[PDB]
Design a protein around this ligand. Structure first.
Ligand SMILES: NC(=O)c1ccc[n+]([C@@H]2O[C@H](COP(=O)([O-])OP(=O)(O)OC[C@H]3O[C@@H](n4cnc5c(N)ncnc54)[C@H](O)[C@@H]3O)[C@@H](O)[C@H]2O)c1
Ligand SMILES: Cc1cc2nc3c(=O)[nH]c(=O)nc-3n(C[C@@H](O)[C@H](O)[C@@H](O)COP(=O)(O)O)c2cc1C
Ligand SMILES: Cc1cc2nc3c(=O)[nH]c(=O)nc-3n(C[C@@H](O)[C@H](O)[C@@H](O)COP(=O)(O)O)c2cc1C
Lengths: 230, 230
């Protein structure tokens, strides 16, 4: 079917044309996101649509100077939002890490619905997690209140490039039957060879990155917004 | 198009027939999940397919006695996995909260691709966050190693019920233009009335839950597996 064909045809698009996305298309992309499952129907995700050209420029910089953030027809910012709940009832305790996990999982689910909806319409896109490296600055720029935090952005627009589909680790490595199975390094070597043909190896790159520090300011940032304190 | 139609027709299915999911369908569902975007191409998600009936029963109880966990044709458990990286390179530091956020977000993205793929085939499903009630016990049952943790499960199978689509908060409440906008309590009251018509109110129910403690054992659990320690 068309749904599975769209899912399997995915590839991040980082170059867009100037052709805008229609109001009908955008509204449909948003409705698709809303139709996503929500943990306990809490609906803890907020989307900040950035149309202001100056804020776009600042966000492109806060993302690590990723130009496509400014050139994209649309730029959405996904945030954890327990402020809605806090406004309704001030007795809400939103500092439990469980709630941050829910915000993160539910955001990914919603964002993927938005992306797939866009892709099925012939649009291209890419997630922007780089915003987290400048979390505090991005948070202030968008005026996020207490019990709210930024997770990632998303570029949407008409493609101006046609990249090849990137191969993933094989299903037998990712999927485990009944119990977690030990990793067979021979599978990793085969994957590295596969990735080399596509393009330092994959395994060397990803593990080298994790060998150092991974944005140590993240927990302090979440805590400053009153999240993940216990 | 068909993709958008499938997305908008979503409703959680909690009643399944005894008809199993074919190998071809399951493989396609997994392939759809693998086609999802990955943060820095880290591929930090692992899926544990539970075919053991004795384990299914225990998981059903651990999930809060949710019967459909046992009756579902397929039950997939999504986990954060940095053990693959740790096996390749022992110098990997996987305790940074940033890495747990990446795991949670990426899991949601992958899982949604799996669900949509299934739903497009005429199948039904429901996320199972209830596994977190007994996270530590579910972890030991599945034999998850260090740098790995359980997030949620997913029931899949042929539907034996036809629930009506649940309405979400209006787009103007969830979507903010350029900056975070203050909540208009009138919109929440309107939504409550909409939910009452579908069926205490929604706002009263969700905030009442958040007024209590939300799975306080979660952070300690993550820490016990070497995650979210700093
Ligand atoms: N009737 C109740 O008091 C009650 C309470 C909680 C959830 N629910 C129902 O469970 C599902 C909600 O899942 P969630 O997104 O909140 O996830 P979740 O992760 O909170 O899992 C459901 C939790 O609610 C408990 N529960 C109590 N009655 C339940 C019931 N009749 N069916 C299933 N679980 C029940 C379970 O033990 C479990 O801890 C919905 O179908 C909802 O209608 C009902
Ligand atoms: C939550 C998340 C954040 C991401 N952040 C970035 C980012 O900041 N910039 C970028 O160019 N790509 C980012 N990516 C996307 C890609 O790196 C991408 O998914 C890729 O490595 C796999 O290729 P494909 O998406 O083309 O299949 C992100 C992916 C996810 C899931
Ligand atoms: C990550 C996640 C976990 C969830 N956990 C459960 C669960 O344990 N049990 C259940 O019956 N429903 C669960 N739900 C699904 C429903 O609560 C559901 O999304 C619902 O409240 C909204 O209705 P719909 O999905 O039918 O549109 C979960 C949803 C998500 C996103």
């Amino acid at each position: 079917n068309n749904t599975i064909e769209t899912i399997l045809a995915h590839r991040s698009i980082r170059k867009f044309t100037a052709v805008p996305i229609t109001d009908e298309q955008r509204q449909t992309i948003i409705q698709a996101g809303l139709a996503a499952s929500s943990s306990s129907m809490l609906q803890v995700v907020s989307i900040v649509r950035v149309t202001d050209s100056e804020k776009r420029n600042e966000l492109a910089q806060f993302a690590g100077n990723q130009a496509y953030v400014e050139s994209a027809a649309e730029f959405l910012v996904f945030c954890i939002d327990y402020q809605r709940h806090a406004t309704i009832n001030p007795d809400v305790q939103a500092d439990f890490t469980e709630l941050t996990l829910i915000g993160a999982v539910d955001s990914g689910i919603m964002a993927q619905n938005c992306l797939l909806a866009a892709e099925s319409m012939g649009l291209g896109g890419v997630y922007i997690g780089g915003l987290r490296n400048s979390a505090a600055q991005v948070d202030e720029l968008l005026g996020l209140p207490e019990n709210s935090a930024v997770l990632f952005g998303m570029c949407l627009g008409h493609p101006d490039q046609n990249p090849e589909v990137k191969p993933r680790l094989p299903a037998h490595v990712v999927v485990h039957e009944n119990q977690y199975q030990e990793l067979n390094l021979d599978d990793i070597q085969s994957y590295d060879q596969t990735m080399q043909a596509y393009y330092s190896t994959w395994s060397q790159e990803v593990t080298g990155k994790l060998a150092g520090e991974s944005r140590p300011h993240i927990l302090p940032y979440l805590n400053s917004k009153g999240l993940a304190k216990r």
